[PDB]
């Protein structure tokens, strides 16, 4: 009891304005700021120059001690396994893997030239992968053939070239949407992906693409279905069709699966810190391609294998512009899913080290690299999660790594040719199949966010929902108008509580709560946390009138029924009450004021002033003083700008705070019967 | 300098949470509360009765001196007026007018029955009108003629009835939709209908109709159009055919269009306060009526008539169930659209003189009037704008006004039935484009939104753009959407203020906002009147750290810059900054510590938490406490079961108010230096 001493006047409001002053700050040339830029400034250029070109700025800082190794290594991990999965992806898409080799070299070169974060991988991706398969086989069917070919039993080479005709249009059209956007600065718009909703996304892409594999692990086909229910169709297909199986892909898929499974943990137990980790997946390739070479698996059980590959380069062509009014939602759903992903998984990464990453570039440079990949025979591209997860676990420093893993797929797409011929699709699923561990365990956030708070339990619960039984596009859209709807939810439910002041001092907290806080006699405050707008505006009314226990209406029933029973034989804004007064009065409280608190309300518009002034009105009509306190700068606006302040006297109403109005309201009774 | 004595000590948090105690009011039997409910309770049955029956509460309260005769002008007033305007919506919708009148007669007897609002008027309505039109044409076209008829050269007859059959269909599906949403509590959705986004659909509603029946006012047959730019298609339709046009239709039309323009205009100025108003549009059709009979224009001139009136009632008949599996979908966008107009317009004119609608009942009641009524050959109904106006703006005081507009329509259909049979189409147009008036006022609220609020302005011009160039559905899904969205976009940007004290007391206010408010000396104060939620967490850091002036990575790159340069020859929170603090100190402020205003802050969530974890634990490796002052329970609840208040020391950096956080930082300053 030393320290806090105030002694200060009453605030009530016009005190205060006539207390202070006023400044102006005026700013000069208001709309022509911008018209000094596009000068000769050498520092200005310089830094345009590096925002555009990420390139020149990152890149002297080179030391050589642990960063070289780092790197080096990083390199050789995410090479190795961009390979596999990258002809798994490639597979995926009803397109031969060369493509899927194209896409691994082409754009990863250029996006090493335009690029702000340092740790990410660059690849076919998975999700975007299966988006192009099904655009390829509804917009070119398995059964049109055109007569006037070879005239064979069967021919599978038209269909081909037109499919990857398609693929080329939809990359293109993905490209020049993507740097459109990021030219036009609409990269702002990431900050609507919570955590969650990713979590909830990644979960249902990972069992998307675990269900779609799984026909392939085990060996037979089955016709490929795309739209609402995909994930259901496919698995009753597979799961109607297990018998008639192939043992043999069967057992080599199961065999690898289990040596990468025991090799992780082994890895992740075994103290290779100070080593470098082993390329578990190269060295599954290199097993099940020697196996089925050298068991000539092909004819031997009639296995699935990767097929020829053409061992060279192809020039550049001009893809066809003749079918974007066929292909134009779908590119717009690739883009934006593609952008999301990689904008989420650079932001994750960002956070950690020491860096934040910008929005619309990376947007710029995804746009580019995919326009130049379609010029270059090269389907749509994004950031791969397990890629980059594995180049930031393994020390990558920047986007070299990317350019290692670049000069690598060049040496496979150029120097093998006919090493990875005899290669099983089963060892492809279980590489898959096992790299989606890390996605499949994020489903313990559900313990975690049923006890924290449900309102992110059921964010997630509704993107895994609407994002695996519903498309993919549809439930991206749709968890992200819910993730907002949320906020309007939220705000529409606040909690009412009626204040009570602690003994001898100035603090008004929650009256049962604390079991030693007492209303002021003739008084009761009423706190909102909340705005108050349209959509709120009945709520706090109906809660003000029921939790303080002061029902206008009521009162003035009871007292035209006692003065109905009793006969047996230029603006005024306050109006006391005539009564007889002498037993009618019903045995309750005797409040004479009631103060509302204002400092937790944000804004309010017409709606909400409307009803202040009702609740205002009807008060003073009944015969109980209304006042606000703590209103800050923009309500007073808010309320100045409606016609609410006509100051026949509602100017006084306002406090600076609760103290204050509970000792004027004091002051103003005592003047009264006491005077 | 006399009131406002506090003399209180600093409490932090620690301190006032051992100052007080803790109470439980726990409730029991959660879950079982409504168990002891349905009960042999007479009040209970007696109010649950009096809420599913309106009749029975409003009946008994019936005077004479000027109730009974202002309500029998109130429905002389409104026969007259849904007379005609209901024929025409009847027309509107490829139907005969005798289905019209069934609508002007069955729905509004039972409304009577199921009510809340005392003063709403029930009839065809325009908009529903349009929609039940545009279904029958689409449906039924007018070139499918089934050739085992009459075998004629025209026949109209079978058309007409399969658009009566599909009429009925869609009616039936609506009523039976809008008794189950009332019955599932799904009426508690209107409080989203802002006023500007009512004006603005009642607006483009009235475009709409003025439109469609400038065509009929001309007199050109034209096709009609439905879909996405079905005004500009009618537009530009009817004007492409502007010539070979009949001109004793335009004439007659313009004739009674002035004549209703120039009587209401004088009605309004003249002194018809004491009397009744006289029905202007009752004198209109029968002089039309009389005109078109004496001068025999149907086939003097070929002009178009309302045609033959079958004179009778009709039995009861059972609709079709079989076309729901086509009329699903149009059947929830006049549901929705009935419902919505109609509690606006209920709401609206219920805060006027006494009393407060519900809502789930409006719906119960809607729905068995439109189911009932496709029963008896009736398509659907809504509230009308111009008929409520005229009936509350007459000396209606219940339902009873409908009442007598039902007997007259009785009268009407089992009377007169030759009377009404040569009535040009011209007089109805023109009483309809007449009516239109008072919608078409409602432009004046654009100047007002425009100095009141931009915001309101927003919403009203996209309501206005969605609703008239694309669909009324779609219009009225996307305004409310956008009108959801509009408190995203308001919450996030905030405005960001930095606090100064005034002299010698404890009110902190704008710095640059009022010219005698100081800085207080080594410490800066930040206030955002917002949630810190996921969508406005960076925003705001980003503004701390630029506002302030105060960048930790700007201060650690200059320190470090600095040491190289002299270089020539279980859980601690807070770290002092080594330095050898001679000449390379720069010029600037000397900030010890930053405080955090949070009493306008309503909620946060993990992200929240995650980036003022990530803001404390910077300023702490910099060198500068961070304080919070006004958290409220909230706020406390958030951060606590988020993992926060891990207690090295975080939960002594809470402080109840800024002044005490002034206090607290100067102490402990103090106590530093000088002890
Ligand atoms: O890399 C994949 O296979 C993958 C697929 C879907 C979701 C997350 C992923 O890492
Ligand atoms: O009654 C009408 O004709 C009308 C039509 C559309 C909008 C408002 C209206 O009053």
Redesign the pocket.
Known sequence: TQRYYVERPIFSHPVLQERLHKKDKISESIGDKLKQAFTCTPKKIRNIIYMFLPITKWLPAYRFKEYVLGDIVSGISTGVLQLP?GLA?AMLAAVPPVFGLYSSFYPVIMYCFFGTSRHISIGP???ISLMIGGVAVRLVPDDIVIPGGVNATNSTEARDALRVKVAMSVTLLTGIIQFCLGVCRFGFVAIYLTEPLVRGF??A??V??FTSMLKYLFGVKTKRYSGIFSVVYSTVAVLQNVKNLNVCSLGVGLMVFGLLLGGKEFNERFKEKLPAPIPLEFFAVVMGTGISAGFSLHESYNVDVVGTLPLGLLPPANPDTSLFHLVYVDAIAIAIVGFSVTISMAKTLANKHGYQVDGNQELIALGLCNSTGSLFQTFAISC????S?VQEGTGGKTQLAGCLASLMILLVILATGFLFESLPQAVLSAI?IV??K??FMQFSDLPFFWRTSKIELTIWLTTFVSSLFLGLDYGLITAVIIALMTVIYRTQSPSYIVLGQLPDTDVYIDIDAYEEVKEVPGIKIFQINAPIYYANSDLYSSALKRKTGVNPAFILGARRKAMKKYAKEPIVTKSTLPEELQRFMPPGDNVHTIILDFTQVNFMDSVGVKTLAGIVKEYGDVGIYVYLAGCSAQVVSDLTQNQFFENPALLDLLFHSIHDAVLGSQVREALAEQE
């Open positions: 999965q992806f991706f998975a999700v990644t979960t892409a990972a998307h693409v791969s999660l397990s890629r997860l898959v790299n989606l890390g996605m």
